[PDB]
Amino acid sequence: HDRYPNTKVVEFAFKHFLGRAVKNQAELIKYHGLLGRKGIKALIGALVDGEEYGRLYGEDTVPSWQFPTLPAANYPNSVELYNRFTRQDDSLVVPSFKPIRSKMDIASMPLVQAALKEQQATKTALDMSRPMFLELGRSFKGAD
Amino acid sequence: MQDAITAVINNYDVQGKYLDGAALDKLKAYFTTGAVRVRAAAVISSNATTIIKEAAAKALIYSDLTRPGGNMYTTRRYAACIRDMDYFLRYATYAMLAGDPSILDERVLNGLKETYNSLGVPIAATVGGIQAMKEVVGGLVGPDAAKEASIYFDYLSSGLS
Amino acid sequence: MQDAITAVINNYDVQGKYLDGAALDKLKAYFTTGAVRVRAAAVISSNATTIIKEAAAKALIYSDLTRPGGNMYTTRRYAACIRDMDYFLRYATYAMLAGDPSILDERVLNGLKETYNSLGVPIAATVGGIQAMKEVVGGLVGPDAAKEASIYFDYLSSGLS
Amino acid sequence: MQDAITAVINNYDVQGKYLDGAALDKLKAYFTTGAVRVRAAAVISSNATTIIKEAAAKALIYSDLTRPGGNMYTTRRYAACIRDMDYFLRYATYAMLAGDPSILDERVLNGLKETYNSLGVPIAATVGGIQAMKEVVGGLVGPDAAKEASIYFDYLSSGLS
Amino acid sequence: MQDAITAVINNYDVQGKYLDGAALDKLKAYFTTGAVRVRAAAVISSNATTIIKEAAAKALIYSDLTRPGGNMYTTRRYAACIRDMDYFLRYATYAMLAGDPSILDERVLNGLKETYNSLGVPIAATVGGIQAMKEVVGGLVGPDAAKEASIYFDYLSSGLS
Amino acid sequence: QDAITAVINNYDVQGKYLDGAALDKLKAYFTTGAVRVRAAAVISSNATTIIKEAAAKALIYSDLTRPGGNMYTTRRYAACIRDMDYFLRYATYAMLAGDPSILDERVLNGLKETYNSLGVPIAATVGGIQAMKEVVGGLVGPDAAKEASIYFDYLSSGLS
Amino acid sequence: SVLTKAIVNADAEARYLSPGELDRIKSFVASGERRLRIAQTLTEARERIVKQAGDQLFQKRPDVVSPGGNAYGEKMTALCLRDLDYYLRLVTYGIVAGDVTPIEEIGIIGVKEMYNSLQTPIPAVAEGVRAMKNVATSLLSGDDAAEAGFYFDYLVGAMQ
Amino acid sequence: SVLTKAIVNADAEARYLSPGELDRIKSFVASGERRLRIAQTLTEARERIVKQAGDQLFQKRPDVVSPGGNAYGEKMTALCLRDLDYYLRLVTYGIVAGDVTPIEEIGIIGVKEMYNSLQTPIPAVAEGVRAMKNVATSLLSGDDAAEAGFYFDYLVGAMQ
Amino acid sequence: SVLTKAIVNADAEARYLSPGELDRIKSFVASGERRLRIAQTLTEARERIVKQAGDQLFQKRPDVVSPGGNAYGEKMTALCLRDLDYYLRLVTYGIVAGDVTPIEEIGIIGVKEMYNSLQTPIPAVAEGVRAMKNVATSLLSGDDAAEAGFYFDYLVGAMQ
Amino acid sequence: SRYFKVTACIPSLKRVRTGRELQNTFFTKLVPYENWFTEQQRIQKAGGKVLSVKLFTGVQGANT
Numbered sequence A: 001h002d003r004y005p006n007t008k009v010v011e012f013a014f015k016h017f018l019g020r021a022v023k024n025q026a027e028l029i030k031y032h033g034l035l036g037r038k039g040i041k042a043l044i045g046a047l048v049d050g051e052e053y054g055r056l057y058g059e060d061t062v063p064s065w066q067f068p069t070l071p072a073a074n075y076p077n078s079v080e081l082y083n084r085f086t087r088q089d090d091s092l093v094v095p096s097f098k099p100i101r102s103k104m105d106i107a108s109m110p111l112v113q114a115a116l117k118e119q120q121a122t123k124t125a126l127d128m129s130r131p132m133f134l135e136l137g138r139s140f141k142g143a144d
Numbered sequence B, C, D, E: 001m002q003d004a005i006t007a008v009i010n011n012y013d014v015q016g017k018y019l020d021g022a023a024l025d026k027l028k029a030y031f032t033t034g035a036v037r038v039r040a041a042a043v044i045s046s047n048a049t050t051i052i053k054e055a056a057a058k059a060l061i062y063s064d065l066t067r068p069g070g071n072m073y074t075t076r077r078y079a080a081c082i083r084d085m086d087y088f089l090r091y092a093t094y095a096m097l098a099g100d101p102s103i104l105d106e107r108v109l110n111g112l113k114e115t116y117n118s119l120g121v122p123i124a125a126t127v128g129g130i131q132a133m134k135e136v137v138g139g140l141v142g143p144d145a146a147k148e149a150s151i152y153f154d155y156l157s158s159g160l161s
Numbered sequence F: 001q002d003a004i005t006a007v008i009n010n011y012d013v014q015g016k017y018l019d020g021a022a023l024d025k026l027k028a029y030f031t032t033g034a035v036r037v038r039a040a041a042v043i044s045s046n047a048t049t050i051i052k053e054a055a056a057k058a059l060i061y062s063d064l065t066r067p068g069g070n071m072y073t074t075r076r077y078a079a080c081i082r083d084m085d086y087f088l089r090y091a092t093y094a095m096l097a098g099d100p101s102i103l104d105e106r107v108l109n110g111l112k113e114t115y116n117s118l119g120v121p122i123a124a125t126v127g128g129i130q131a132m133k134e135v136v137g138g139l140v141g142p143d144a145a146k147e148a149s150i151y152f153d154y155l156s157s158g159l160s
Numbered sequence G, H, I: 001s002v003l004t005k006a007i008v009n010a011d012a013e014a015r016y017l018s019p020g021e022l023d024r025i026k027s028f029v030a031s032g033e034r035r036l037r038i039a040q041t042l043t044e045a046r047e048r049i050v051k052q053a054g055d056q057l058f059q060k061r062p063d064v065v066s067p068g069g070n071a072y073g074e075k076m077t078a079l080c081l082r083d084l085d086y087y088l089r090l091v092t093y094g095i096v097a098g099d100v101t102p103i104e105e106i107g108i109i110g111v112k113e114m115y116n117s118l119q120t121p122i123p124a125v126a127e128g129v130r131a132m133k134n135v136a137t138s139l140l141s142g143d144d145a146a147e148a149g150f151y152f153d154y155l156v157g158a159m160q
Numbered sequence J: 001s002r003y004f005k006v007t008a009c010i011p012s013l014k015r016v017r018t019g020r021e022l023q024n025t026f027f028t029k030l031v032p033y034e035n036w037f038t039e040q041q042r043i044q045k046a047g048g049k050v051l052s053v054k055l056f057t058g059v060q061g062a063n064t
């Protein structure tokens, strides 16, 4: 706690009580949140009470380094944490997860693109269940 | 993650605009495509084991990798590689249903290059495997689904490379 | 963390020197300022919620940030920003009592820039908010206390920028 | 020319749409304003000579224009200028009743700039006179009517300039 | 960079496909639009100074930015901002002739966000200016050209956002 | 667990294949289901108020809240309303499930012992539960109320 | 519209609006709200008015829907009904305007020439409009019907 | 969205989507077109819904628009109405999504904290949303209204 | 069942059931009646399904019913058929539940260990289940068969 | 500070375990008052049954 900013404090707590780094930004928010607005004693208490701790360490096992495959950056991030000696680097392994832009728009995808052509092209044609006299009178261009 | 419906919503929300007809049309387009996507997903799930088998046979196995001193040598490593292949397939299926490539970026693509480099896993071989899976998947899903399926596979491949 | 008294002690300890009159005078200087600081701290604690409100009103709200597409748009982001403001205030109060800027460096300042850059939070706006808090605080604490309070606020601002 | 009622009709006719409630509301809006407009028109007609006199006094007379070598020097030119002023007033009154600016464009505005430039009549001074008439008219018609009257006067001014 | 003709060619070349009718149709579409684009470009070049002036008047000037403590305060900063505006205009004109957005990505869009953040230039205000230029440009170019011109302006705006 | 699963489990211990009589019970549940879903949504929306009203009916303006009472002090008051919330949430779960078992597994298990050590008064708690039931009954409407009532009564009986 | 007509007369005389002219404008603005309702009624009943009038017209004139006749065949019959619909829309526009001018520009100038090229009989078209009037009259209240009748009569007079 | 929710559950389980889950996705895509219409209706009536709800809220709570109250003054009243508009936009987003998640991220997380800094009373805000619901319900058809109601109710629950 | 799953997720989150979650419950209760019919069909045909599947299995694997093989002898053959019957009963339970969980707890956990102690070959057991599936599919209508197939496939997957 | 002495039994329903794991199945433990609430819930969610709860330290119904 005492010589580290509150984010780095959540790192260390994850490392020490679950054996992992912080998996995602939602998790960073929940725990870092609770560390503000309550003690460090609350953070520690939440981890050990949570389900992850319960699933894997149970009541009688000492936690250990998880070395997780799974969420995504978790494996590389955890292993950077495990490799550092005490006081070797104080820097955040994960300051926070940077949010990602969109490479492709919805309309570029083939199935959508096709469905747009079908509605757009032949948007105006002949309507069934409409009496013909009403249909012949209907205007296509409308405004302009 | 994000899906096509949510993507439209999010774009409007940043503008602060209420949903408009043009936006509605994009949503409508997605809804029609949906039925096809669901059928494709079911096909992939049922044939997942085979898809992986075929793809491995095409690219991974009978190679230096499987021979001693190769990355896929030893049972442990072999099992890991096929587990990774399964991941890619599952996520691609999720993306196809979603209609958005974002989930791939958020879960699969993020940190993968770095992980692989530390592990010493060969990226090009992995990409080869993904491409192989794509080809097999294209056949099973059928033509309409194929084009949609292919884009997500290509997205994964481009990210890794 | 470190304070003024401990800072003097530490400087002497590295020299190995026993405490000397010059050192004693620095300590004496701190002791006179101390009483004022305690009063200021109590004022800030009682008015903390209002201080944040006023500062936000001055800079953060009624702005593009709060408008859609702005960093502080959405309730979640708004709440985060005011939480950050509270942090800065609490730590500045701690620093003022201590008479040393070190605690700010150890807790607040270290890694903040990097965090903010990843988040996309705008540093200049944050700095603006800190400066606004300083102005509000200055009023409440009164002039003698204000000078002392200002230096810590300025220290935070310089660190972020 | 066109009037407000016909404008609504024409917009619907190009669409081919039957009249709808939204359209009806616009028509209804006009009908309420109508009574006020009729009263205003009668006021203007009765006070037309005076309106012109007052406006001329405000801008045109006691000026270089009226002095020798000025555009409005000589009886003939003076008479011409006041005749033009009357035209503007009459047409503005017509427009106010109609609720549409089109008549101004069709009769008054079309070719006036070019005519004036060839003649060497000063446009800015003419515009000044129109604005003066507006002010005088505003008084006589009263506030509710004045807002309606003002827009047509401003339309004339913008066209000339 | 690329232009529309080359973009089609490049897409075919990676596929290894000979040019096909569908591809030809895209090329044919471009060829018809071409003549209009050339005329639009000449209009923009001649009126470039005015376009910038009008857009600045609409958004940038008479604002806090120009007032002391604002980003565009001081002659040096004012000159920089109008230089940036000119860049956007010139590149958009290039893109319009090309029929491809790629040049904007390669030259303007790449690294702009980061540059602006370091400088402390406000992105939203810049975007506002771009949108203002678009509106002015739309008038001068005329309607057919305006649609084409608008997409490139919007592309720049979206990138900066 | 659930009404459907309860039937299954009873058959499994017998080793019997599912039979028409069993099927009829399952069918009965399926019809009731739609009503239950509507009731649950009503309760969730009005949960805060339900608790408020029930407290007003029984807990507050009482010796408990007065000094020397169990619910005296902010900490104790907050605890009691937290417990009230849990009873409501679990009853809602039970109503959807159509089975009392979840109440036994979650709420009822270890409650009595905890309360006795704390010195929390069971009868007052039961009173609060009954009050919540009455408020809930109004909001849900009559058909839903009968179903809702049984789970509330089950909780009350367990605590007592 | 009434207003357009008044302005035009004034401009010809080169004078400001006469008191009498102003009074007519006042009357029109008062009438307008009633007029709007009359128009609304016909719009709602439009589909049925056209259908009923068509049938009446075809009964009145067997020839038009006969192999020789212009109206004969589904395509042609639809076009004949479309024409009736057009005229009804014009009539509604007229009622709100309070004058035939809107009707006149869209429908009555060059009508003879257009129909002569088409070879459609002008009298039959007039009968169709008369038929529409009768249907419209029935749905309208008596006073409302009289107002509507004037516009219908004008159309019949214009095309004969 | 519904689909996002299903995918997320699958990913947690580390499994491909179940057939049952897939079926629910199919149902949702069919429902979407109806949902779009419901959303469209509210969007068109948005301006009036906000206005009517505002008036109702101010009648229900005189205090908020009183010199002491937060809402009092033109600037403040506008902001209160802007907030109501925001919540309506969120509700429309929810209906098309078929899930409250879109609504929840933008509007319901940290809402308490934001309003407490502003000093706006949370219960009054909830009343405003309730008021908007009533107006919206009237314009919507009954089945459409029920769908819309769920999203409105969630908001009211969130702001409690 | 599905409902149990939904409740459990809510309890973990300590929140009332989400609207989306509630909707899924509604869908399940509607589906249940159809599910019951599918289960009923298999129950009636149970005796024949087991018999036919047994014969197929023994043809596919002569070894199991051979002096060396585990199944050999009357007592042993009966036990092998009893096992097939057990799995069928579990499948029926699954169909009504709409989830594999009921099946899973009774039959799939520790199955490998149990059979290894018995020395029964696991692949042969899987073949028997596959055989039962084919018989069951024939009696079921196509859509019903697909639903039943999923549960059968799960069993085959579990015993692998 | 108040402490709770709790005896609870939790069955291993998800998997058979080769390790003896007697301690995990049956455990008597001292719980801080604040922690117990959460712990009780967690035992319930696991499907373990809490046979006995007692307040080891502190006085029941004590204001401070």
Ligand SMILES: *[C@H](C)[C@H]1/C(=C/c2[nH]c(/C=C3N=C(/C=C4\NC(=O)C(CC)=C4C)C(C)=C\3CCC(=O)O)c(CCC(=O)O)c2C)NC(=O)[C@@H]1C
Residues within 6 Å of the ligand: B060, B061, B062, B063, B066, B067, B072, B073, B074, B075, B078
């Ligand atoms: C022989 C008793 C059985 C048998 C063997 C068999 N294996 C393959 C193919 C491969 N088997 C391996 C196995 C290993 N790689 C390792 O690293 C280890 C541990 C050191 C082992 C044991 C691998 C990797 C392959 C893939 C080919 C390659 O090396 O690249 C086959 C043929 C593959 C196919 O199915 O086409 C066979 C036949 N098959 C039997 O049925 C026997 C019972």
Ligand SMILES: *[C@H](C)[C@H]1/C(=C/c2[nH]c(/C=C3N=C(/C=C4\NC(=O)C(CC)=C4C)C(C)=C\3CCC(=O)O)c(CCC(=O)O)c2C)NC(=O)[C@@H]1C
Residues within 6 Å of the ligand: C060, C061, C062, C063, C066, C067, C072, C073, C074, C075, C078, H064, H069, H070, H071, H072, H075, H076, H077, H079, H080, H081, H083, H084, H086, H087, H106, H107, H118, H120, H121, H124, H125, H128
């Ligand atoms: C109306 C029912 C109540 C009310 C409203 C009120 N709100 C404000 C000011 C703000 N409210 C918001 C809210 C939002 N911003 C978001 O991002 C979202 C989700 C999309 C919401 C709902 C914000 C951010 C502001 C700050 C203003 C700004 O934009 O800078 C006021 C004005 C008070 C002030 O000092 O600004 C008012 C009056 N007040 C009541 O008491 C009513 C019950």
Ligand SMILES: *[C@H](C)[C@H]1/C(=C/c2[nH]c(/C=C3N=C(/C=C4\NC(=O)C(CC)=C4C)C(C)=C\3CCC(=O)O)c(CCC(=O)O)c2C)NC(=O)[C@@H]1C
Residues within 6 Å of the ligand: A005, A006, A007, A028, A029, A032, A033, A096, C065, C071, C072, C076, C077, C078, C080, C081, C082, C084, C085, C087, C107, C108, C109, C112, C115, C119, C121, C122, C123, C125, C126, C129
């Ligand atoms: C308010 C002036 C500005 C603002 C802030 C803002 N911050 C976040 C998110 C985070 N803020 C922090 C910061 C700190 N954690 C620490 O340990 C310290 C040092 C004491 C600080 C200051 C952290 C770590 C987070 C992330 C996790 C969390 O939310 O708890 C946000 C939200 C960003 C998002 O995209 O979600 C915001 C908005 N932004 C503004 O607009 C102001 C300029």
Ligand SMILES: *[C@H](C)[C@H]1/C(=C/c2[nH]c(/C=C3N=C(/C=C4\NC(=O)C(CC)=C4C)C(C)=C\3CCC(=O)O)c(CCC(=O)O)c2C)NC(=O)[C@@H]1C
Residues within 6 Å of the ligand: D060, D061, D062, D063, D066, D067, D072, D073, D074, D075, D078
């Ligand atoms: C004196 C015999 C009578 C009289 C005169 C009078 N004139 C004005 C104002 C103006 N007179 C003129 C006249 C001319 N401008 C020209 O170009 C020519 C021909 C060359 C003439 C005759 C003008 C233009 C004005 C307006 C002011 C100006 O010069 O710009 C007044 C003042 C009235 C007023 O209110 O403006 C008067 C009094 N009036 C009498 O009672 C005498 C019988």
Ligand SMILES: *[C@H](C)[C@H]1/C(=C/c2[nH]c(/C=C3N=C(/C=C4\NC(=O)C(CC)=C4C)C(C)=C\3CCC(=O)O)c(CCC(=O)O)c2C)NC(=O)[C@@H]1C
Residues within 6 Å of the ligand: D065, D071, D072, D077, D078, D080, D081, D082, D084, D085, D087, D107, D108, D109, D112, D115, D119, D121, D122, D125, D126, D127, D129
């Ligand atoms: C008085 C406010 C200003 C003024 C007027 C002025 N006009 C003329 C001469 C002409 N003005 C017109 C204008 C019109 N002709 C049209 O057909 C229309 C629209 C339908 C208009 C409004 C024309 C054509 C003439 C020439 C012939 C004529 O007057 O009949 C003059 C005299 C110019 C001359 O040398 O004859 C004057 C003075 N000029 C000003 O300086 C005042 C600001």
Ligand SMILES: *[C@H](C)[C@H]1/C(=C/c2[nH]c(/C=C3N=C(/C=C4\NC(=O)C(CC)=C4C)C(C)=C\3CCC(=O)O)c(CCC(=O)O)c2C)NC(=O)[C@@H]1C
Residues within 6 Å of the ligand: E060, E061, E062, E063, E066, E067, E072, E073, E074, E075, E078
């Ligand atoms: C006066 C001697 C001459 C004159 C002045 C004039 N200036 C403007 C508008 C602006 N002037 C500035 C200039 C500065 N901003 C700075 O930061 C500095 C250096 C400290 C300077 C000198 C700016 C930015 C503007 C734009 C408005 C704004 O501040 O927002 C005008 C208005 C014209 C316009 O188009 O805006 C004028 C008239 N012009 C003359 O004709 C005089 C001889």
Ligand SMILES: *[C@H](C)[C@H]1/C(=C/c2[nH]c(/C=C3N=C(/C=C4\NC(=O)C(CC)=C4C)C(C)=C\3CCC(=O)O)c(CCC(=O)O)c2C)NC(=O)[C@@H]1C
Residues within 6 Å of the ligand: E060, E065, E071, E072, E077, E078, E080, E081, E082, E084, E085, E087, E107, E108, E109, E112, E115, E119, E121, E122, E125, E126, E129
């Ligand atoms: C104008 C609307 C806004 C504005 C602009 C502004 N820009 C700068 C400085 C720079 N702008 C650029 C940008 C570019 N260089 C490129 O190559 C491209 C793409 C072709 C762009 C768009 C660069 C690199 C600079 C830095 C170097 C330079 O000034 O030439 C400033 C000066 C900022 C400073 O601190 O010096 C300003 C003011 N200012 C606003 O606020 C407007 C919204």
Ligand SMILES: *[C@H](C)[C@H]1/C(=C/c2[nH]c(/C=C3N=C(/C=C4\NC(=O)C(CC)=C4C)C(C)=C\3CCC(=O)O)c(CCC(=O)O)c2C)NC(=O)[C@@H]1C
Residues within 6 Å of the ligand: F059, F060, F061, F062, F065, F066, F071, F072, F073, F074, F077
């Ligand atoms: C006065 C500043 C504000 C106010 C007060 C108010 N309180 C109640 C009801 C209760 N208040 C308490 C408070 C306490 N009980 C405790 O044990 C402690 C700690 C020592 C406190 C402070 C309690 C328990 C109640 C419930 C009733 C009861 O005591 O039996 C009300 C009435 C609300 C109701 O519906 O009961 C009121 C009005 N109200 C304001 O708005 C003032 C700003």
Ligand SMILES: *[C@H](C)[C@H]1/C(=C/c2[nH]c(/C=C3N=C(/C=C4\NC(=O)C(CC)=C4C)C(C)=C\3CCC(=O)O)c(CCC(=O)O)c2C)NC(=O)[C@@H]1C
Residues within 6 Å of the ligand: F064, F070, F071, F075, F076, F077, F079, F080, F081, F083, F084, F086, F106, F107, F111, F114, F118, F120, F121, F124, F125, F128, J033, J036, J037, J040, J041, J060, J061, J062
């Ligand atoms: C309210 C209706 C009555 C009341 C309640 C009350 N309870 C406590 C303390 C606790 N109550 C529980 C109960 C539960 N824990 C669970 O896990 C569940 C199932 C979800 C329940 C119902 C527990 C464990 C505690 C201890 C710690 C905690 O806060 O959870 C108190 C406080 C007593 C004390 O001495 O601190 C009170 C007051 N008592 C009344 O007065 C009402 C009749």
Ligand SMILES: *[C@H](C)[C@H]1/C(=C/c2[nH]c(/C=C3N=C(/C=C4\NC(=O)C(CC)=C4C)C(C)=C\3CCC(=O)O)c(CCC(=O)O)c2C)NC(=O)[C@@H]1C
Residues within 6 Å of the ligand: I064, I069, I070, I071, I072, I076, I077, I079, I080, I081, I083, I084, I086, I106, I107, I114, I118, I120, I121, I124, I125, I128
């Ligand atoms: C038939 C497909 C194969 C086969 C079967 C076989 N089983 C046994 C003996 C037992 N089988 C079971 C199985 C179960 N008991 C359960 O509770 C469940 C879950 C509901 C199952 C599936 C058990 C426990 C026994 C022991 C006897 C008993 O339960 O009374 C045998 C006899 C072997 C023995 O030593 O008992 C046989 C032959 N054998 C094959 O090879 C077939 C492929």
Ligand SMILES: *[C@H](C)[C@H]1/C(=C/c2[nH]c(/C=C3N=C(/C=C4\NC(=O)C(CC)=C4C)C(C)=C\3CCC(=O)O)c(CCC(=O)O)c2C)NC(=O)[C@@H]1C
Residues within 6 Å of the ligand: J011, J012, J015, J016, J017, J019, J020, J021, J022, J025
């Ligand atoms: C088999 C001969 C009889 C039988 C056994 C049975 N045991 C359990 C469950 C458990 N048994 C133990 C016992 C031990 N754990 C240890 O560490 C040791 C010493 C090394 C022993 C002997 C435990 C702790 C359990 C709990 C589960 C676990 O995996 O630890 C069961 C399951 C009962 C249940 O419902 O959970 C059974 C069936 N029972 C019989 O019927 C046989 C006569």
